[PDB]
Amino acid sequence: APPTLWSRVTKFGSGWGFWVSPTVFITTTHVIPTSAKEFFGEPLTSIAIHRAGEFTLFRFSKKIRPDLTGMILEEGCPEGTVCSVLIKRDSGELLPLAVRMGAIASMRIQGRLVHGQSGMLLTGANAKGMDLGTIPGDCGAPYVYKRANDWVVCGVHAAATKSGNTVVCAVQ
Amino acid sequence: PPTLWSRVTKFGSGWGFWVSPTVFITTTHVIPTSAKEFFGEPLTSIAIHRAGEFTLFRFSKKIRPDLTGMILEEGCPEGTVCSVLIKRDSGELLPLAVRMGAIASMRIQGRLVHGQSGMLLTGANAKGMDLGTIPGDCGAPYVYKRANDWVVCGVHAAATKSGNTVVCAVQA
Ligand SMILES: c1csc(-c2ccc(-c3cc[nH]n3)s2)c1
Secondary structure, three states: OOHHHHHHEEEEOOEEEEEOOOOEEEEEHHHOOOOOOEEOOEEHHHEEEEEEOOEEEEEEOOOOOOOOOOOEEOOOOOOOOEEEEEEEEOOOEEEEEEEEEEEEEEEEEOOEEEEEEEEEEOOOOOOOOOOOOOOHHHOOOEEEEEEOOEEEEEEEEEEEOOOOOEEEEEOO | OOOOHHHEEEEOOEEEEEOOOOEEEEEHHHOOOOOOEEOOEEHHHEEEEEEOOEEEEEEOOOOOOOOOOOEEOOOOOOOOEEEEEEEOOOOEEEEEEEEEEEEEEEEEOOEEEEEEEEEEOOOOOOOOOOOOOOHHHOOOEEEEEEOOEEEEEEEEEEEOOOOOEEEEEOOO
16 A cells, blocks of 8 residues: 555554544544543634544644645445455554455444444455554544555544454544 | 564565564565674574475574564465455554465566465555555565464465565475
8 A cells, every 4th residue: 555545544542543634534433542532732712523433533723744745535335335444453564455345234232232334354254453454543544445546545444343344433 | 472473574575474472474576685684693503494485484593572472374375365464654553354266377577476376355446555566575474363263374476566466485
């Protein structure tokens, strides 16, 4: 995946978030620290928060990331699309996990009710672990895919099943 | 707790895999043809066991004493879904699912290669997106989880231009 996509992946709360543009940051609602009143040196006052279940969008009044160009954010992707989940792990290692996306789903995973776009990992047969699959610290990592000449972001990592084979992307 | 990924090591014109502190496997064709040492050990002290595109090195001292010994097998049962553990010089880690087939001699871009055939499971096009193999990936290991045990069953020898078909070189 291109360097300009990896540059947008930002350590945040208990997981990650993604810069769509200089003013727009997206993340998984449950990774956001509950007491937080400041983000990138700005007060809540100065920020427009748009929350839909496990999807949260932050729109800043000023350019926090002026090095970046605005990208396309879509509301999930067609069934059958292959996405990469842009996961950073211990070492500056970069793990673009391949996932075949499916239908919008409602699930119970461990102790929680989760809603978003379901996918199946294409990394291995029994991806329950850090080497081939996701771990709880990956929450907020972006789902991206290439279309013709463009890259698109279409959601953020919200949950995985006990087996690790099924993941859920929260969508706008 | 050393990951599988720490066992994958840049070597020659591709990669290789540490099975144990003293055992290193790779694709025969990536090995330098001019050398007096590997990993700081003189060639006098290294046992080289070659079988077509599969080579095993057995060192007289512990090169990777941080590692436990893993199961090495001569390929796997037909239908096993293995993971090819690809490292790239970007720092990206690309585990790709491959459904394994029969041992054969296959014509791969006008060349005969003997090993275990496999088909990538990342679908349509495996190039333009991190979804398939490229020439510098040779030597990457084929692994799978069986009960509690990780199994390594060979090394990446060849892939078609098309994308779909790969060859895993195997021991004996
Ligand atoms: C039997 C007939 S085709 C086939 C598979 C296709 C895709 C699979 C898969 C599993 C994990 N990642 N991709 S399994 C098995």
